[PDB]
Amino acid sequence: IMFSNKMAR
Amino acid sequence: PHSLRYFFAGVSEPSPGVPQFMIVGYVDGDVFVRYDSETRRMESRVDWTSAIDDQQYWERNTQIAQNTEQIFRLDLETLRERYNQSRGSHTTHVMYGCDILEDGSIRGFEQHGYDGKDFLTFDKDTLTYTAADAGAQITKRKWEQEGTVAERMKYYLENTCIEWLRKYVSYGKDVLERRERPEVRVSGMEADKILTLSCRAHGFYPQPISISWLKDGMVQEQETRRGSTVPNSDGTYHIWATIDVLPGDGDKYQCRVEHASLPQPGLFSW
Amino acid sequence: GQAKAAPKVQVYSRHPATAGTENILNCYVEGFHPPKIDIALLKNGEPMKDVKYNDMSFGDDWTFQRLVYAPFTPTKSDVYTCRVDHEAFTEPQSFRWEPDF
């Protein structure tokens, strides 16, 4: 499963 | 080994055959999911995913994909300005995932790219990001100051990722563990007093393979070259290898193919 | 600014080829950046029929890759090429399938 939501750069 | 990997790419503007945003997921090197930008949904790309039976699995992946699509649009605008770049088709990339090695040990990866270059690399064992340039440092500081970015990723890579990888390897076992033996052809062509022998292996699965040459039954590395492994349309693979030999000596050489489909490495002659 | 990486190309048949025998012709294009690219399969300099373009992927050096393929029935007189145009090439490049029978 994908990681739930990386932060914006 | 086993591996789960997710690859994300964004481009400022589309072009023929190139969507603005894409996600592809791989288990043990084989695609298993992909984002459809038109329907905005994560979709299966291999039939064994029907065994993923958890409720809302697809909806949850689709929600993450749609959120990430919006974030990628923001990142492209942010980084164009941070690097004082002209407008144009810029790119941005993320890859992350996990490995289970032969001894059961694990590895985890999270790497960020911008415009075809390294941007940030995660070290889960020290909970820090390595920045490739001063511009990437600004994001490093933002994320390390938020204070939970590294911790949440390390937990995902060491727990969630590994748990799902073990499930996918079990669901996909009959596809992932199948063995296809290559059809191997050795050929030769002479030019400038040199006979180049080519050994081509067609249609092997799985992907790992090793090709070497024997001269009168002995290993011969002199004047050998090889291509990168490349895919066929059916998910099997292809590779070539060559050796330069004296004209007249072609019968002395054998191609030696090490592959999981061959319990003993196979030998082939022209 | 943006990294420019030229395509690397291989042209190969799905099966070991036999003159007059239906097969599949593959053109695998990899290692390029940015993703914008034009790939064409040609038979004696003319566009081939029934060409399929798989979706693009990319590797951890941030370069992209794509398989392009088509059924074909090679003969000893026909010439098959993969033509690739990309901004990291100074000129469009043609890659010839080696007829290995």
Please tally the β strands of chain C and state the result. Answer: 9
Number of helices of chain A: 0
Number of E-type strands of chain A: 0
Please state the CA-atom Rg of chain A, rounded to the nearest Å.
7 Å
What portion of residues of chain A is helical?
A: under 10%
Estimated helix fraction of chain C? under 10%
Taking the sheet with the most strands of chain A, its summary is:
none
Outline of chain A: rod-shaped
CATH topology of chain C: Immunoglobulin-like
Family (chain C): Belongs to the beta-2-microglobulin family.
Subcellular location (chain C): Secreted
Keywords (chain C): Immunity, Immunoglobulin domain, MHC I, Secreted, Signal
Protein name (chain C): Beta-2-microglobulin
Give an overview of the whole structure:
The complex is a heterotrimer of chains A (9), B (270) and C (101). Chain A is mostly loops. Chain A contains no helices and no strands. Helices cover 0% and strands 0% of the residues of chain A. Chain B has helices at 57-82, 134-146, 149-171, 173-176, and strands spanning 2-11, 21-27, 30-36, 41-44, 91-100, 106-114, 117-123, 128-131, 183-191, 194-204, 210-215, 218-219, 224-226, 230-231, 237-245, 253-258, 266-268. Chain B has two domains: 2-176, 2-Layer Sandwich (Murine Class I Major Histocompatibility Complex, H2-DB, Chain A, domain 1), CATH 3.30.500; 183-268, Sandwich (Immunoglobulin-like). Chain B has an eight-stranded antiparallel beta sheet, with helices on one face. In chain B, strands 9, 10, 13, 14 and 15 form a five-stranded antiparallel beta sheet that branches. In chain B, strands 12-11-16-17 form a four-stranded antiparallel beta sheet, with no helix packed on it. By secondary structure, chain C is an all-beta fold. Chain C has one domain: Immunoglobulins (Immunoglobulin-like). Chain C contains no helices and nine strands. Chain C has strands at 8-13, 23-32, 38-43, 46-47, 52-53, 57-58, 64-72, 80-85, 93-96. The N and C termini of chain C lie far apart (46 Å). Chains in contact: A-B, B-C. The B-C interface holds B 7, 9, 11, 15-18, 22, 24, 31, 34, 83, 85-86, 88-91, 93, 95, 111, 113, 115-118, 183, 185, 187, 198, 200, 202-203, 227-228, 230-234, 238, 240 and C 1-5, 8, 10, 12-16, 24, 26, 28, 30, 33-38, 52-58, 60, 62-64, 66-67, 69, 100.
